[model samples]
Target: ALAKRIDAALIVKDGRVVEGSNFENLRDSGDPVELGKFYSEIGIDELSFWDITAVEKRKTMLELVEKVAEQIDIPFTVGGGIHDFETASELILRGADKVEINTAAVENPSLITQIAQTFGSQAVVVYIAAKRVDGEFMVFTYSGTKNTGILLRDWVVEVEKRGAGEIVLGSIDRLGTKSGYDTEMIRFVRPLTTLPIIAHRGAGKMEHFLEAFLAGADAAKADSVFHFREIDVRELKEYLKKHGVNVRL
Candidate 1:
């Protein structure tokens, strides 16, 4: 538990780990349980299984959670059907270290406060699929299909005040681009909330990782880089350590 520096995550959609452009057009990364076990073996910091379809299924994903938890012991988060306290609580009880909410949180903002009250703010995460619409970050709902027309900076501030534990910032435009993160957006959100920021999307190389952290993101997440084995996380933590980043390797 000493290596409290950076985090590496495995993204699962439906019941499988997947990679694609902007979360659509997904090609299989691998079986979720097996890939999760592999990530655990490689010392991945977190596991994220997004019910990509957002259909709010029960048994299938529940079984996947049991299967993944059987092999990995790292912090894991579950999302995609979290509409109320019961649903989120069930995921936590079933083994999710935390639960992420996107669509519902946008539709009824007060749910953030209610969930935080029950699970504590530290356990509630706001998973945002954001895109730059006309020079501003627009929040999307239901796997980036519906644009909520909410400003990114304003939403984070409200999310913070509502007691969200963390912000999983996924850029819809940058996802799968491999160009880099949205540094402007990262910097914009940094001062707005003191909570930990998990920067996601548009990661291809080491400098991309560095830019995210420099822009005030505490951790980074990517789809293709880790899926295709472009970067080794063990080596990544070592490099960050050398750069004077306080990571527990």
Candidate 2:
């Protein structure tokens, strides 16, 4: 199987990654930590889990934080259901190394600052979905249905002030299409903040990774390409090294 070859296959059931063949909720049972343990038992370097339904349920983001921390030793990133400073802080205290905020930050700008102040700028990460029109950059949220109206520059400045340590700028238009990363978006936001930037979406090949780093991204996250085994991280790192880009295997 492809997962076995890449050694990164995750088991999903009922649209959720089960933790030890079970799921836990805040009230009584299901915990992400248990799920983490299940995956670790099989041997995996890292894990990334997203709570796709968290927004609909309107629950605190950190509800499963302690459970995840207790279960896994390898690094992991938790998302979904986070929208405000309180939820962000609780997750951090519970064990999240980094917090990913999307819709809430776009809807309410102050939440970014509040979390940054409490958790330090390095702990906060803001996801930006961008699109290009007539050479101008626009921001969107809520799964790209809602427009923030704020330009990328203005938003980055505000987020930087609020103490965000990093930015994940995603290009929805180029996402999955894999034509390539939106170079324009990276170039535009790169100058706005000193914080490290993670280029998300639109990575189709190893060359795309080179472009992202050349354009000033601190790192890049790929989904389809990585999932389907179009390219491997080891090869990607080697390519980056050849290009004189600093990378760690």
Query: Highest TM-score, which number?
Result: 1
lDDT of 1 by residue, 129-247 (tens): 88988888899987888888899888998999998999989888886688898888888888888988999888888778778888988777664677667887777777777886666
Against the true structure, what is each candidate's TM-score? 0.86, 0.77
User: Once superposed on the true structure, which residue ranges of model 1 sit more than 4 Å away at CA?
Assistant: 1-14, 19-29, 53-56
Q: Residues 132-207, candidate 2, lDDT per residue (tens digit)? A: 6567677888777676677778877877877777777888788558778887789888887887777777777889
Report the number of backbone clashes for model 1.
2
Task: Output the TM-score of candidate 2.
Answer: 0.77
lDDT value for model 2: 0.65
lDDT of each: 0.75, 0.65
